[PDB]
């Protein structure tokens, strides 16, 4: 049994990726952000303040014959970019890409921060990190994928994200036909609740991998590739027009730069992010200055292989084996 759900970038700068999820009976279809960097499935709902939810699709549990409120359950989450949300908890049927989890924790937001209010195209998150991170109290809720995993053909899911084009989130099988190399695996450390792994080294512009390893997390819910200041410095060292822009809070450079690739080692295999994908966006319409897809992790204190990196590959989140696979795309 499998699931396959088309995803799409929310805007022209691939800020985040959106995928439909059907909750309840009959199905209420919500566009949600699948986030392998958090552990809670939360939605804008009929309990979200109308002033916060206006313009967003919402889940209304009273119109679902399979919903049930979880007495005494509450939750609150603060995200890496300063955004937040909090609420109470229902269970209901949740179907993604045609595969259903019958009794899934669906966290209803009774408060969300301005960032989520303004992002009208999403209606919440599906947390796909480890169950240990789930924020429901007193009793944590399992993630949709953890609940689905024992009933799928295999307990794995894949992310295929693309620049400016629809991609897919698949469950229960590995569609390598979207990739041009084989899946290479490395072990995951779930001690902090994340898909944390170590890349064995990196290279800028295509020479041999160095052995300067990088510990970081595979996060479909982060836009950028966020790496330490030494790596950022190495990446931009020969990008002539590169400079830190205090207003953008990031490195920028002329849009016509021919950017070098960024490669990193998954065990002894290489994944290469082409320079194309390291140019995120012009600073505004018609601008000659562009914002880099690789930026410093020094602000958040943890390296994050976000969508900029994930776009270079078919990425296998293998919960059965607690490993992370990357096939060059």
């Amino acid at each position: 049994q499998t699931g396959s759900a088309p995803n799409h970038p929310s805007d022209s700068a691939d800020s985040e990726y959106i995928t439909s999820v059907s909750i309840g009976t009959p199905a209420q279809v919500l566009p949600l952000d699948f986030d392998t960097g958090s552990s809670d499935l939360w939605v804008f709902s009929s309990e979200t303040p109308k002033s916060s939810a206006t313009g967003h699709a919402i889940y209304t549990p009273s119109k679902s014959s399979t919903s049930k409120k979880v007495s005494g359950a509450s939750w609150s989450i603060s995200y890496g970019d300063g955004s937040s949300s909090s609420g109470d908890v229902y269970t209901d049927k949740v179907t993604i890409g045609g595969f259903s989890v019958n009794t899934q924790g669906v966290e209803s937001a009774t408060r969300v921060s301005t960032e989520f209010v303004q992002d009208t195209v999403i209606s919440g998150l599906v947390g796909l990190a480890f169950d240990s991170g789930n924020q429901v109290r007193p009793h944590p809720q399992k993630t949709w994928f953890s609940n689905a995993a024992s009933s799928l053909a295999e307990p794995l899911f894949t992310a295929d994200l693309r620049h400016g084009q629809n991609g897919s989130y698949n469950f229960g099988y590995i569609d390598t036909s979207v990739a041009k190399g084989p899946v290479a695996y490395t072990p995951v450390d779930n001690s902090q609740g994340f898909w944390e792994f170590t890349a064995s080294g990196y290279s800028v512009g295509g020479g041999k991998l160095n052995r300067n390893s990088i510990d970081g997390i595979a996060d479909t819910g982060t836009t950028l590739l966020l790496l330490d200041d030494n790596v950022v410095d190495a990446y931009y060292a020969n990008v002539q027009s590169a400079q830190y822009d205090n207003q953008q809070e990031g490195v920028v450079f002329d849009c016509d730069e021919d950017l070098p690739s960024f490669s990193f080692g998954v065990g002894s295999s290489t994944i290469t992010i082409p320079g194309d994908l390291l140019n995120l966006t012009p600073l505004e319409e018609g601008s000659s200055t562009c914002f880099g897809g690789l930026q410093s992790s020094s602000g958040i204190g943890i390296n994050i292989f976000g969508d900029v990196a994930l776009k270079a590959a078919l990425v296998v989140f293998d919960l059965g084996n607690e490993r992370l696979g990357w096939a060059q795309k």
Binding site: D35, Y79, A129, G221, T222, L226
Partner: peptide, 6 residues
Amino acid sequence: XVVXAX
């Protein structure tokens, strides 16, 4: 950017 549960 967005950065999702620090």
